[PDB]
Amino acid sequence: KELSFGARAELPRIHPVASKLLRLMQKKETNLCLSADVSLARELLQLADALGPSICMLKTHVDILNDFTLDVMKELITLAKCHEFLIFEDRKFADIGNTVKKQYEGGIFKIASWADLVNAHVVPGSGVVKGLQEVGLPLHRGCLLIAEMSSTGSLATGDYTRAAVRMAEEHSEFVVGFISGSRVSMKPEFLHLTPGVQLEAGGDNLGQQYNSPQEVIGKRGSDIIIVGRGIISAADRLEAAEMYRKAAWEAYLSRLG
Amino acid sequence: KELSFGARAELPRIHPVASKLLRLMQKKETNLCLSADVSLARELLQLADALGPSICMLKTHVDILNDFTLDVMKELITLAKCHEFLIFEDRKFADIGNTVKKQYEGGIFKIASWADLVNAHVVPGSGVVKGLQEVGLPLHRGCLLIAEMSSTGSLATGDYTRAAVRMAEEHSEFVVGFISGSRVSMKPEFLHLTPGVQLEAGGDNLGQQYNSPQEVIGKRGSDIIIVGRGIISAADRLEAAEMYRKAAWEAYLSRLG
Ligand SMILES: Nc1cc(=O)[nH]c(=O)n1[C@@H]1O[C@H](COP(=O)(O)O)[C@@H](O)[C@H]1O
Numbered sequence: 271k272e273l274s275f276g277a278r279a280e281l282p283r284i285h286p287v288a289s290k291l292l293r294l295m296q297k298k299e300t301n302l303c304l305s306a307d308v309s310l311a312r313e314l315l316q317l318a319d320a321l322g323p324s325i326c327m328l329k330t331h332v333d334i335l336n337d338f339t340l341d342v343m344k345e346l347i348t349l350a351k352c353h354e355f356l357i358f359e360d361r362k363f364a365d366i367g368n369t370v371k372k373q374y375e376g377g378i379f380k381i382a383s384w385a386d387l388v389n390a391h392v393v394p395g396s397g398v399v400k401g402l403q404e405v406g407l408p409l410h411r412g413c414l415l416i417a418e419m420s421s422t423g424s425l426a427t428g429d430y431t432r433a434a435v436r437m438a439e440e441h442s443e444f445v446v447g448f449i450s451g452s453r454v455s456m457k458p459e460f461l462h463l464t465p466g467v468q469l470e471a472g473g474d475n476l477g478q479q480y481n482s483p484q485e486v487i488g489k490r491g492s493d494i495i496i497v498g499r500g501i502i503s504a505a506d507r508l509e510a511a512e513m514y515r516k517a518a519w520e521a522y523l524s525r526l527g
Numbered sequence: 528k529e530l531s532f533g534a535r536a537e538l539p540r541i542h543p544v545a546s547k548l549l550r551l552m553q554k555k556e557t558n559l560c561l562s563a564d565v566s567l568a569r570e571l572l573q574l575a576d577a578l579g580p581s582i583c584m585l586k587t588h589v590d591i592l593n594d595f596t597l598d599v600m601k602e603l604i605t606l607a608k609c610h611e612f613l614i615f616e617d618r619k620f621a622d623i624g625n626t627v628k629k630q631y632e633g634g635i636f637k638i639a640s641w642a643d644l645v646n647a648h649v650v651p652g653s654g655v656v657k658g659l660q661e662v663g664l665p666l667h668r669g670c671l672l673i674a675e676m677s678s679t680g681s682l683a684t685g686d687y688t689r690a691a692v693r694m695a696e697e698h699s700e701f702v703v704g705f706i707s708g709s710r711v712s713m714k715p716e717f718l719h720l721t722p723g724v725q726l727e728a729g730g731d732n733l734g735q736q737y738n739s740p741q742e743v744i745g746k747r748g749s750d751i752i753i754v755g756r757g758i759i760s761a762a763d764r765l766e767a768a769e770m771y772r773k774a775a776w777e778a779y780l781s782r783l784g
């Protein structure tokens with residue numbers, strides 16, 4: 271029988287980052303991750319502040335920010351602490367271990383310095399995780415492995431997905447879960463986060479495909495919905511975030527039944 | 528029958544960026560791409576200028592430069608034009624089409640403004656290419672698809688590699704070739720670039736595996752070697768670049784008969 275988020279926060283094998291997340295999800299009654307796909311720091315921070323109470327997590331693509339600075343990320347950390355949500359940089363590390371270690375720690379973005387969570391493609395083999403984990407371990411960071419993708423023609427299926435799950439199990443001191451379309455692991459210490467989510471049926475013009483929060487949380491067994499345009503494109507982003515939060519939260523409650 | 532780089536430069540279906548590359552390869556007798564894996568702009572520029580005459584291409588990870596600015600890029604372009612080599616940003620785009628479009632055109636790096644070539648993982652499905660091409664085609668750029676990887680445990684094998692080749696075939700207005708360990712396409716319009724290259728047998732401590740220039744160019748039929756540490760860690764980077772250039776060039780000549 272399915273454990274609540276609060277109970278999963280207490281699992282013996284739980285990573286500290288996953289535990290903090292699960293605790294705030296339970297506290298705030300939200301399993302919504304905002305995909306803050308904007309190009310302006312001011313818009314990012316205004317959404318983070320207004321929607322902070324409604325979300326468990328804010329997912330960034332800082333490489334799309336036109337006016338990125340480390341001071342912007344400092345302000346984002348302040349809002350994340352104030353409102354209690356994790357920061358997830360959707361960087362999709364996908365290179366050899368020696369390279370991703372530098373991409374995570376260094377350069378202009380210094381992603382490890384501010385992101386609670388990052389993600390990696392499993393295509394390079396487990397060196398991708400080993401390289402990241404050397405940086406993320408003393409910083410008490412976590413990583414999500416990309417086990418499935420939402421887009422048309424995704425090759426992250428079958429044995430590929432299985433390889434991601436095995437890699438996660440073998441690196442559970444750093445890997446806290448998955449980007450996937452459905453539950454892919456039966457181990458409850460792993461988080462499942464699912465993008466390609468909208469209330470309405472459809473897709474976009476570049477291969478994105480959508481499923482509803484009820485389908486993804488309720489039937490497919492995932493934990494958190496990641497929602498970009500379904501919220502960002504609304505006139506009132508707060509009302510939209512609330513619609514998504516209630517959808518995902520009630521689907522989760524249903525599944526506990 | 529195998530064609531020279533100079534003849535391949537003239538093929539009817541050749542992409543203009545591949546043609547430019549192939550002509551300078553022939554002209555300079557170099558099929559060496561320097562992997563300029565450094566953390567400082569000064570070093571990137573110093574190596575680009577010193578090794579420029581020995582290389583057909585300089586591969587960047589701009590996200591590992593502690594002091595990236597667009598002015599550094601502007602200088603790098605000046606060197607590329609002076610010495611005649613292409614700039615290849617090894618960004619490994621690997622997200623949905625709508626996202627990579629932004630990551631290629633925008634943010635702080637403005638990658639499409641300066642990179643002749645970029646690369647993409649094929650795992651998201653062909654939307655990754657469609658998104659990139661919306662930015663890359665107007666800017667007269669090319670893309671390489673990652674068909675194989677050099678690292679231990681790579682999942683880019685078998686049907687995954689075949690999928691990469693099909694996707695390239697089908698997007699030949701923008702995709703000019705592959706990152707691969709061997710020749711994966713029989714079509715001579717496509718370039719094959721191979722990383723994981725050193726003169727000696729070995730690897731690194733995070734899953735890199737090395738093969739020699741003779742093995743990669745001569746036996747495995749690839750076109751260009753990509754070499755980082757084999758050159759940059761050497762005491763004499765000029766001599767090292769020349770050894771790799773001579774090795775790759777004579778392996779090509781031999782294969783050619
Ligand atoms: N990380 C992802 C993995 C994935 O499979 N699909 C996906 O859309 N994403 C990201 O989620 C967000 C989906 O946004 P939207 O389609 O809801 O606007 C975008 O930032 C994508 O880059």
Ligand SMILES: Nc1cc(=O)[nH]c(=O)n1[C@@H]1O[C@H](COP(=O)(O)O)[C@@H](O)[C@H]1O
Binds near residue numbers: 675724755756757
């Ligand atoms: N793009 C790559 C694809 C790949 O399969 N292997 C690889 O090493 N790379 C890159 O090539 C370079 C290899 O450098 P070195 O091992 O020669 O130092 C690094 O920048 C890697 O990120």
